[PDB]
């Protein structure tokens, strides 16, 4: 859970480029070690607290800063659009910067991107394992369907490695800080976004088998339209004999679109 070191905290705020004119969404302030540091540099901070135990200390930590607003709501259940337009009226740019709990990590990140919010960016402390998959390029063992999904909406890059000793309960696993810069629009153009993500799952279902095999076993049209699939692979210049892990998002986008027309 709790981020002890003051130096690390400030490097986080540096990588989130927080200035006199930034609005900041924090998630999970604890005793407010990071929150205090954001209050010092942001125009306005909005922290989402759920935990009831630490709240009077957070209130003591946050007592001498007028520019912070604690919200007693799960960020997974909140309308971030409402909170945004309400609190960040004086703020030009918005950033999410948080130390996120280890279990809700991927879900929180994925709710926020799917909400299509006016965020400049998200900077977050999470598990090193999880951060390496998110910013994976296809030369990496960690490159999979989660790489594809966050790279759709944003530009992903790990910025920091942090040791276990920086936290109060020293965790099992090492941690890292990742920077996600929201793109202008989608990284690729697809007719059907939903079918595109089904495809990414199916292509990555078994890392040791061919693209062709994986599609035939994991698309619901695989067996019934195998010939049709083989056709679309050829027409899009994707050797079906390669692994899904060697394919780039440009190629998946091209293959999704192809298959959508031929299969439906």
Q: Rounded to whole angstroms, what are the CA distances from 51 to 18, 60, 75, 113, 249?
A: 26, 16, 12, 24, 39
Distance in angstroms (rounded) separating the CA atoms of residues 203 and 217 = 10
What DSSP character marks residue 72? -
Distance in angstroms (rounded) separating the CA atoms of residues 54 and 56 = 6
Annotated binding site: 1, 3, 28, 49, 74, 99
- Technique employed here was X-ray
Core vs surface per residue 62-100: b (16+ CB within 10 A) or e: beeeeebebbeeebeeeebeebbeebbeebebbbbbbbb
Say what the resolution is, in angstroms: 3.0
* 3-state secondary structure (DSSP) of residue 152: helix
Annotated binding site for S-adenosyl-L-methionine: 1, 3, 28, 49, 74, 99
Spatial CA neighbour of 222 closest among 205, 235, 239: 205
Kindly list the structural domains of the chain, giving each domain's residue range(s) and its CATH number in brackets, ordered by start. 1-187 (3.40.50.150), 188-264 (1.10.8.100)
Among left, alpha and beta (phi > 0; psi -120 to 50; other), residue 32 is left
Distance in angstroms (rounded) separating the CA atoms of residues 223 and 69 = 55
Among left, alpha and beta (phi > 0; psi -120 to 50; other), residue 116 is left
Distance in angstroms (rounded) separating the CA atoms of residues 190 and 200 = 13
What DSSP character marks residue 246? G
């Amino acid at each position: 859970n709790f981020l002890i070191d003051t130096n690390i905290l400030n490097r986080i705020v540096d990588h989130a480029e927080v200035t006199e004119k930034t609005g900041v969404i924090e998630i999970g302030p604890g005793i407010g070690a990071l929150t205090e540091q954001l209050a010092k540099r942001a125009k306005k901070v909005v922290a989402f607290e759920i935990d009831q135990r630490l709240l009077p200390i957070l209130k003591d930590t946050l007592s001498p800063y007028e520019n912070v607003t604690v919200i007693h709501q799960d960020v997974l259940k909140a309308d971030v659009k409402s909170v945004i337009e309400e609190q960040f009226q004086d703020c030009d740019e918005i950033m999410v910067v948080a130390n996120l709990p280890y279990y809700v990590t991927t879900p929180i990140i994925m709710k926020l991107l799917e909400e299509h919010l006016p965020l400049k960016g998200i900077v977050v402390m999470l598990q090193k394992e999880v951060a390496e998959r998110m910013a994976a390029d296809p030369s990496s063992k960690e490159y999979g369907s989660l790489s594809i999904a966050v790279q759709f909406y944003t530009e992903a890059k790990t910025v920091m490695i942090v040791p276990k000793t920086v936290f109060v309960p020293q965790p099992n696993v090492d941690s890292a800080v990742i920077r996600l810069i929201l793109r202008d629009g989608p990284a690729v153009d697809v007719e059907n976004e939903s079918f595109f993500f089904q495809l990414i799952k199916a292509s990555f279902a078994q890392r040791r088998k061919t693209l062709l095999n994986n599609l035939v076993n994991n698309l619901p049209e695989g067996k019934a339209q195998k010939s049709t699939i083989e056709q679309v692979l050829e027409e899009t210049n994707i050797d079906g004999k390669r692994r899904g892990e060697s394919l780039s998002i440009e190629e998946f986008a091209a293959l999704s679109n192809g298959l959508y027309k031929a299969l439906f």
